[PDB]
Amino acid sequence: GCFEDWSRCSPSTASATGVLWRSCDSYCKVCFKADRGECYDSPSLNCPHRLPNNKQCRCINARTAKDNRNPTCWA
Numbered sequence: 336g337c338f339e340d341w342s343r344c345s346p347s348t349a350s351a352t353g354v355l356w357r358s359c360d361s362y363c364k365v366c367f368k369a370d371r372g373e374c375y376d377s378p379s380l381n382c383p384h385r386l387p388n389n390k391q392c393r394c395i396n397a398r399t400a401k402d403n404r405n406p407t408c409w410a
Contacts, residue, residue: 336378338376338384338389339356340389341376342356342374343360343374343392352385358390358392359391361407362392362408363397365407367400368398368399369395372392377389377391
């Protein structure tokens with residue numbers, strides 16, 4: 336139940352702050368030039384916003400390595 340990054344590709348809980356929790360589809364898209372991100376949440380936790388754990392995603396069909404060309408890839 337850690338929704339914020341899980342929300343990157345799941346339009347439900349529109350929230351983001353600081354790190355932005357861009358970890359999933361947003362990050363995989365531009366950085367590893369993946370096809371999509373799998374926005375799942377850490378099921379072991381149920382955390383209500385400002386989820387400092389909620390950086391968890393698979394970059395599907397990631398075509399590149401960690402890349403720096405995008406400001407949203409700076410992390």
